[PDB]
């Protein structure tokens, strides 16, 4: 097995994804060896997802020959599940990412969002607390929880966060449709 393929596979397994704008060599190595990487990851019940438009390569749970697996009982998955509050915040962030990606052209940039923009839109649904410090603590805690899934970054000195492109593959229309169906079932009885 070639050294570069092994290095790229190990790095991707360690971090969970490869981005072209940060690790171009490994991204190119892993992009041109789809069959080899798939054969390597088959024994581990894992698969590789590709996105050439955004320059992204990520790792997902391989779909076996069972009607339902929940994809969270896989032995190698360490994170916890996502609850309703985090799903709501993810939906808000996905809307912001749509807005960012629509009005962009050729060139490299990043999606930055300030907390003060996020606070009122979440107040609309969750409600309102007395002091401002309470709401700031709530938002900071939620963003810290979301950082563990690799969806955002830590707060800057100017009180801003970066939205990672991987969210575009977490809230793709299929997953959104499934979530909407499930939530509609939950609400009506």
């Amino acid at each position: 097995t070639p050294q570069r393929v092994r290095e790229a596979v190990q790095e991707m397994l360690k971090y969970g994804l490869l981005e072209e704008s940060h690790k171009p060599n490994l991204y190119r190595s892993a992009l041109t060896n789809i069959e080899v990487v798939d054969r390597i990851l088959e024994p581990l019940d894992l698969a590789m997802g590709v996105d050439e438009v955004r320059g992204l390569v990520f790792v997902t749970v391989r779909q076996g020959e069972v009607a339902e697996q929940d994809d969270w009982s896989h032995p190698l998955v360490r994170r916890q599940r996502l609850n309703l509050e985090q799903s709501l915040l993810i939906a808000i962030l996905r809307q912001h990412f749509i807005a960012y990606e629509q009005e962009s052209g050729t060139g490299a940039s990043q999606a930055l969002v300030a907390v003060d923009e996020l606070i009122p839109q979440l107040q609309v649904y969750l409600g309102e607390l007395g002091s401002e410090a309470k709401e700031r603590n709530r938002i900071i805690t939620l963003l810290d929880q979301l950082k563990g899934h690799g969806l955002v970054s830590a707060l800057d000195a100017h009180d801003r966060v970066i939205i990672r492109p991987i969210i575009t593959h977490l809230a793709n229309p299929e997953n959104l449709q499934a979530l909407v169906v499930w939530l509609r079932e939950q609400v009506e009885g």
Binding site: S131, A133, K134, R136, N137, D144, Q145, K147, A154, A157
Partner: protein, 134 residues
């Protein structure tokens, strides 16, 4: 500088760290600070500081010291990308703002707490109210 250099018991490259822990029913918070001197240039502008606010049970004083010993400053600021319950600040102003937001207090509670923590003698009522409370 006097506390770091033990005014002299320690000269040249040196490391100093402090921490304090607060607990409740089902939670824990830790406030810490790491200061260091690279060489013998004992000056106010040559002391390097970092402040830490943590909730994870894995963040201890020895862990911070090990990270500093292994990578200096970059290894300390790298802990924010490998964990969740850690917040480093290379600035006391933002650190104190975050601290006052965590415990929903005013901007003068800690100053008053510091004044009444070494008061020598209970003077006249007017003097006490005009010198300590206000």
């Amino acid at each position: 500088v006097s506390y770091v250099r033990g005014v002299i018991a320690r000269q040249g490259k040196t490391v100093t760290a402090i921490a304090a822990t607060l607990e409740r029913d089902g939670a824990q918070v830790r406030l810490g600070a790491v200061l260091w001197f690279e060489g013998t240039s004992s000056s106010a502008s040559d002391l390097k500081k970092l402040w830490l606010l943590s909730e994870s049970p894995e963040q201890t004083l020895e862990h911070w010291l090990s990270q500093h010993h292994a990578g200096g400053m970059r290894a300390l600021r790298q802990m924010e990308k490998d964990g969740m319950g850690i917040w480093p600040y290379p600035s006391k102003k933002a650190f104190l703002a975050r601290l006052r937001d965590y415990f929903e207090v005013g901007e003068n509670a800690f100053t008053l707490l510091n004044r009444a923590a070494g008061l020598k003698q209970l003077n006249s009522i007017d003097e006490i109210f005009r010198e300590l409370v206000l």
